[PDB]
Short mmCIF file of all heavy atoms in Angstrom, two decimals:
data_model
loop_
_atom_site.label_atom_id
_atom_site.label_comp_id
_atom_site.label_asym_id
_atom_site.label_seq_id
_atom_site.Cartn_x
_atom_site.Cartn_y
_atom_site.Cartn_z
N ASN A 170 18.06 -65.59 68.05
CA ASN A 170 17.06 -65.37 69.09
C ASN A 170 15.78 -66.20 68.99
O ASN A 170 14.80 -65.92 69.67
CB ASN A 170 16.73 -63.87 69.17
CG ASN A 170 16.00 -63.37 67.93
OD1 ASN A 170 16.19 -63.89 66.83
ND2 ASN A 170 15.17 -62.35 68.11
N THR A 171 15.79 -67.23 68.16
CA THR A 171 14.61 -68.09 68.03
C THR A 171 14.92 -69.55 68.37
O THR A 171 14.07 -70.26 68.90
CB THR A 171 14.02 -68.01 66.62
OG1 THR A 171 15.04 -68.28 65.65
CG2 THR A 171 13.43 -66.64 66.36
N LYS A 172 16.13 -70.00 68.06
CA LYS A 172 16.53 -71.38 68.35
C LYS A 172 17.56 -71.44 69.47
O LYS A 172 17.71 -72.46 70.14
CB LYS A 172 17.10 -72.03 67.08
CG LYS A 172 16.11 -72.16 65.93
CD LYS A 172 15.08 -73.23 66.21
CE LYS A 172 14.07 -73.33 65.07
NZ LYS A 172 13.24 -72.09 64.94
N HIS A 173 18.29 -70.34 69.65
CA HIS A 173 19.30 -70.26 70.69
C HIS A 173 20.36 -71.36 70.61
O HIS A 173 20.74 -71.96 71.61
CB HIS A 173 18.62 -70.27 72.07
CG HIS A 173 17.61 -69.18 72.27
ND1 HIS A 173 17.96 -67.85 72.39
CD2 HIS A 173 16.26 -69.23 72.38
CE1 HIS A 173 16.87 -67.13 72.56
NE2 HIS A 173 15.82 -67.93 72.56
N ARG A 174 20.83 -71.61 69.41
CA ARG A 174 21.84 -72.62 69.20
C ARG A 174 23.03 -72.00 68.41
O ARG A 174 22.87 -70.98 67.68
CB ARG A 174 21.31 -73.71 68.28
CG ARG A 174 20.16 -74.59 68.90
CD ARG A 174 20.77 -75.82 69.55
NE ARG A 174 20.96 -75.66 70.98
CZ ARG A 174 21.77 -76.41 71.71
NH1 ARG A 174 22.48 -77.38 71.15
NH2 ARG A 174 21.86 -76.21 73.02
N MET A 175 24.23 -72.56 68.64
CA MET A 175 25.46 -72.14 67.93
C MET A 175 26.28 -73.39 67.78
O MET A 175 26.15 -74.33 68.57
CB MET A 175 26.22 -71.08 68.77
CG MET A 175 27.03 -71.57 69.96
SD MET A 175 28.10 -70.33 70.79
CE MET A 175 29.34 -70.04 69.51
N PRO A 176 27.11 -73.44 66.74
CA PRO A 176 27.94 -74.63 66.59
C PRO A 176 28.96 -74.77 67.71
O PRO A 176 29.37 -73.77 68.30
CB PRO A 176 28.59 -74.44 65.22
CG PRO A 176 28.64 -72.96 65.05
CD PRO A 176 27.30 -72.50 65.61
N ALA A 177 29.37 -76.00 68.01
CA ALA A 177 30.37 -76.24 69.06
C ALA A 177 31.74 -75.95 68.44
O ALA A 177 32.29 -76.78 67.71
CB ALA A 177 30.31 -77.69 69.54
N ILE A 178 32.28 -74.78 68.73
CA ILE A 178 33.57 -74.40 68.20
C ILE A 178 34.70 -74.83 69.13
O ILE A 178 34.62 -74.64 70.34
CB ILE A 178 33.63 -72.88 67.98
CG1 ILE A 178 32.51 -72.46 67.02
CG2 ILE A 178 34.98 -72.49 67.39
CD1 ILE A 178 32.38 -70.95 66.81
N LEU A 179 35.73 -75.43 68.56
CA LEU A 179 36.90 -75.89 69.31
C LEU A 179 37.98 -74.83 69.18
O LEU A 179 38.13 -74.22 68.13
CB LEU A 179 37.45 -77.20 68.73
CG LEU A 179 36.61 -78.48 68.79
CD1 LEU A 179 37.17 -79.49 67.78
CD2 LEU A 179 36.62 -79.06 70.19
N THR A 180 38.74 -74.60 70.25
CA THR A 180 39.83 -73.63 70.15
C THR A 180 40.95 -74.36 69.40
O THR A 180 40.94 -75.59 69.29
CB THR A 180 40.35 -73.21 71.53
OG1 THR A 180 40.81 -74.37 72.23
CG2 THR A 180 39.26 -72.52 72.33
N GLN A 181 41.91 -73.62 68.88
CA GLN A 181 42.99 -74.26 68.15
C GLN A 181 43.76 -75.25 69.01
O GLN A 181 44.21 -76.28 68.51
CB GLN A 181 43.94 -73.21 67.60
CG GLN A 181 43.32 -72.41 66.48
CD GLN A 181 44.11 -71.15 66.18
OE1 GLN A 181 44.07 -70.18 66.95
NE2 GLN A 181 44.84 -71.16 65.08
N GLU A 182 43.89 -74.94 70.30
CA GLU A 182 44.62 -75.79 71.23
C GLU A 182 43.92 -77.08 71.61
O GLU A 182 44.49 -77.92 72.31
CB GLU A 182 44.96 -75.02 72.51
CG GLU A 182 45.96 -73.88 72.30
CD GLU A 182 45.29 -72.53 72.07
OE1 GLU A 182 44.47 -72.40 71.14
OE2 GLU A 182 45.59 -71.59 72.84
N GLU A 183 42.69 -77.26 71.15
CA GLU A 183 41.93 -78.46 71.48
C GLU A 183 41.70 -79.34 70.26
O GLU A 183 41.11 -80.41 70.36
CB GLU A 183 40.58 -78.07 72.07
CG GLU A 183 40.66 -77.13 73.25
CD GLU A 183 39.33 -76.43 73.54
OE1 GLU A 183 38.63 -76.03 72.57
OE2 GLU A 183 39.00 -76.27 74.73
N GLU A 184 42.18 -78.89 69.11
CA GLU A 184 41.96 -79.63 67.88
C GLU A 184 42.42 -81.08 67.88
O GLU A 184 41.61 -81.99 67.71
CB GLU A 184 42.53 -78.83 66.69
CG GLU A 184 41.60 -77.66 66.33
CD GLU A 184 42.18 -76.62 65.38
OE1 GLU A 184 43.26 -76.84 64.79
OE2 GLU A 184 41.54 -75.56 65.22
N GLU A 185 43.71 -81.32 68.10
CA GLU A 185 44.21 -82.69 68.11
C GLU A 185 43.72 -83.50 69.32
O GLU A 185 43.55 -84.72 69.23
CB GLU A 185 45.74 -82.71 68.04
CG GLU A 185 46.28 -82.23 66.70
CD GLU A 185 45.65 -82.96 65.51
OE1 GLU A 185 45.65 -84.22 65.48
OE2 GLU A 185 45.16 -82.27 64.59
N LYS A 186 43.47 -82.82 70.44
CA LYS A 186 42.98 -83.51 71.62
C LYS A 186 41.60 -84.09 71.30
O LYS A 186 41.32 -85.25 71.59
CB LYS A 186 42.88 -82.55 72.81
CG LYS A 186 42.30 -83.18 74.06
CD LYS A 186 42.09 -82.15 75.16
CE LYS A 186 41.37 -82.76 76.36
NZ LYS A 186 41.18 -81.77 77.47
N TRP A 187 40.75 -83.27 70.69
CA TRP A 187 39.40 -83.68 70.29
C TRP A 187 39.42 -84.96 69.46
O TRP A 187 38.52 -85.79 69.56
CB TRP A 187 38.72 -82.56 69.49
CG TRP A 187 37.44 -82.96 68.80
CD1 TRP A 187 37.28 -83.22 67.46
CD2 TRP A 187 36.15 -83.12 69.40
NE1 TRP A 187 35.96 -83.53 67.20
CE2 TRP A 187 35.25 -83.48 68.37
CE3 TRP A 187 35.67 -83.01 70.71
CZ2 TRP A 187 33.89 -83.73 68.62
CZ3 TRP A 187 34.31 -83.25 70.95
CH2 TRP A 187 33.44 -83.61 69.91
N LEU A 188 40.46 -85.12 68.64
CA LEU A 188 40.60 -86.29 67.78
C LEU A 188 41.31 -87.50 68.40
O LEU A 188 41.50 -88.51 67.73
CB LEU A 188 41.30 -85.88 66.48
CG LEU A 188 40.69 -84.73 65.66
CD1 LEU A 188 41.60 -84.39 64.45
CD2 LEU A 188 39.31 -85.13 65.16
N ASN A 189 41.71 -87.40 69.67
CA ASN A 189 42.39 -88.50 70.37
C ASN A 189 41.40 -89.63 70.72
O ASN A 189 40.49 -89.44 71.51
CB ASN A 189 43.01 -87.98 71.66
CG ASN A 189 43.96 -88.97 72.30
OD1 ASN A 189 43.69 -90.18 72.34
ND2 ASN A 189 45.07 -88.47 72.82
N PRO A 190 41.60 -90.84 70.16
CA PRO A 190 40.70 -91.97 70.44
C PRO A 190 40.55 -92.35 71.92
O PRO A 190 39.59 -93.01 72.29
CB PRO A 190 41.32 -93.12 69.64
CG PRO A 190 42.03 -92.42 68.53
CD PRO A 190 42.66 -91.23 69.23
N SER A 191 41.49 -91.92 72.75
CA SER A 191 41.47 -92.24 74.17
C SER A 191 40.57 -91.38 75.05
O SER A 191 40.40 -91.67 76.23
CB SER A 191 42.89 -92.19 74.73
OG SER A 191 43.75 -93.05 74.00
N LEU A 192 40.00 -90.31 74.49
CA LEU A 192 39.14 -89.44 75.29
C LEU A 192 37.98 -90.21 75.92
O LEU A 192 37.36 -91.06 75.29
CB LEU A 192 38.57 -88.30 74.44
CG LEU A 192 39.26 -86.94 74.58
CD1 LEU A 192 40.71 -87.04 74.14
CD2 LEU A 192 38.52 -85.90 73.75
N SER A 193 37.71 -89.90 77.18
CA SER A 193 36.61 -90.53 77.90
C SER A 193 35.38 -89.64 77.71
O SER A 193 35.49 -88.50 77.25
CB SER A 193 36.93 -90.61 79.40
OG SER A 193 37.01 -89.31 79.96
N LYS A 194 34.23 -90.17 78.09
CA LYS A 194 32.97 -89.46 77.96
C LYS A 194 33.04 -88.05 78.55
O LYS A 194 32.64 -87.07 77.92
CB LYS A 194 31.85 -90.25 78.65
CG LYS A 194 30.48 -89.58 78.61
CD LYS A 194 29.41 -90.47 79.25
CE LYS A 194 28.05 -89.78 79.28
NZ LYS A 194 28.08 -88.50 80.05
N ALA A 195 33.55 -87.96 79.77
CA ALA A 195 33.66 -86.67 80.44
C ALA A 195 34.53 -85.68 79.65
O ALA A 195 34.14 -84.53 79.46
CB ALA A 195 34.23 -86.85 81.84
N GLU A 196 35.69 -86.15 79.19
CA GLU A 196 36.63 -85.32 78.43
C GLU A 196 36.01 -84.80 77.13
O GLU A 196 36.22 -83.65 76.75
CB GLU A 196 37.90 -86.11 78.10
CG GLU A 196 38.59 -86.74 79.30
CD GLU A 196 39.85 -87.48 78.92
OE1 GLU A 196 40.86 -86.81 78.60
OE2 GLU A 196 39.84 -88.72 78.93
N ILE A 197 35.27 -85.67 76.45
CA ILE A 197 34.61 -85.29 75.22
C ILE A 197 33.57 -84.20 75.52
O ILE A 197 33.55 -83.15 74.86
CB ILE A 197 33.90 -86.51 74.58
CG1 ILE A 197 34.95 -87.53 74.14
CG2 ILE A 197 33.04 -86.06 73.38
CD1 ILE A 197 34.39 -88.91 73.85
N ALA A 198 32.74 -84.44 76.52
CA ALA A 198 31.69 -83.50 76.88
C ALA A 198 32.30 -82.17 77.25
O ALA A 198 31.79 -81.11 76.89
CB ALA A 198 30.87 -84.05 78.06
N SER A 199 33.42 -82.23 77.97
CA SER A 199 34.11 -81.03 78.41
C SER A 199 34.61 -80.14 77.27
O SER A 199 34.88 -78.95 77.46
CB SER A 199 35.29 -81.44 79.30
OG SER A 199 36.01 -80.30 79.72
N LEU A 200 34.74 -80.71 76.07
CA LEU A 200 35.23 -79.92 74.94
C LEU A 200 34.11 -79.28 74.14
O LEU A 200 34.36 -78.51 73.23
CB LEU A 200 36.09 -80.80 74.02
CG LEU A 200 37.42 -81.23 74.63
CD1 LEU A 200 38.04 -82.34 73.80
CD2 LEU A 200 38.35 -80.04 74.73
N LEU A 201 32.86 -79.60 74.50
CA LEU A 201 31.70 -79.04 73.80
C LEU A 201 31.04 -77.98 74.68
O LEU A 201 30.22 -78.29 75.54
CB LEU A 201 30.71 -80.16 73.49
CG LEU A 201 31.29 -81.32 72.67
CD1 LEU A 201 30.37 -82.53 72.76
CD2 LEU A 201 31.52 -80.89 71.23
N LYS A 202 31.41 -76.73 74.45
CA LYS A 202 30.86 -75.62 75.24
C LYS A 202 30.71 -74.39 74.36
O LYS A 202 31.25 -74.35 73.25
CB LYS A 202 31.80 -75.28 76.40
CG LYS A 202 31.73 -76.22 77.59
CD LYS A 202 30.38 -76.12 78.30
CE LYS A 202 30.36 -76.89 79.61
NZ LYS A 202 31.29 -76.30 80.62
N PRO A 203 29.97 -73.38 74.82
CA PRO A 203 29.80 -72.16 74.02
C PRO A 203 31.13 -71.42 73.94
O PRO A 203 31.82 -71.25 74.94
CB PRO A 203 28.75 -71.37 74.81
CG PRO A 203 27.98 -72.45 75.53
CD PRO A 203 29.07 -73.37 76.00
N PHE A 204 31.50 -70.98 72.74
CA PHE A 204 32.76 -70.28 72.55
C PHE A 204 32.76 -68.96 73.32
O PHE A 204 31.69 -68.42 73.63
CB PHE A 204 32.98 -70.01 71.06
CG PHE A 204 34.42 -70.01 70.65
CD1 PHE A 204 35.19 -71.16 70.74
CD2 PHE A 204 35.01 -68.85 70.13
CE1 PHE A 204 36.52 -71.18 70.33
CE2 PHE A 204 36.33 -68.85 69.71
CZ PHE A 204 37.09 -70.02 69.81
N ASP A 205 33.94 -68.46 73.64
CA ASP A 205 34.08 -67.19 74.36
C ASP A 205 33.58 -66.08 73.45
O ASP A 205 34.16 -65.81 72.40
CB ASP A 205 35.54 -66.94 74.74
CG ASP A 205 35.75 -65.60 75.44
OD1 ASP A 205 34.75 -64.93 75.79
OD2 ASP A 205 36.93 -65.22 75.66
N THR A 206 32.51 -65.42 73.86
CA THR A 206 31.92 -64.36 73.07
C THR A 206 32.91 -63.28 72.61
O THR A 206 32.77 -62.74 71.51
CB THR A 206 30.75 -63.71 73.83
OG1 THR A 206 30.09 -62.76 72.99
CG2 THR A 206 31.25 -63.03 75.10
N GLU A 207 33.91 -62.99 73.44
CA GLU A 207 34.92 -61.98 73.12
C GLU A 207 35.81 -62.35 71.93
O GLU A 207 36.42 -61.48 71.31
CB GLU A 207 35.84 -61.73 74.33
CG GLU A 207 35.13 -61.46 75.64
CD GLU A 207 34.16 -60.31 75.55
OE1 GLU A 207 34.55 -59.23 75.04
OE2 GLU A 207 33.00 -60.47 76.00
#
Side-chain angles (χ1 to χ4, degrees):
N170 67 330
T171 53
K172 297 288 179 295
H173 303 290
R174 292 267 97 198
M175 77 172 292
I178 301 175
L179 295 162
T180 59
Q181 290 165 287
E182 293 94 304
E183 306 162 320
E184 284 167 11
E185 292 308 307
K186 177 186 174 179
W187 168 257
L188 305 176
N189 191 319
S191 304
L192 260 62
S193 66
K194 179 177 177 300
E196 306 182 73
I197 294 164
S199 178
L200 292 167
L201 304 164
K202 282 293 189 66
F204 211 65
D205 178 9
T206 186
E207 310 304 311

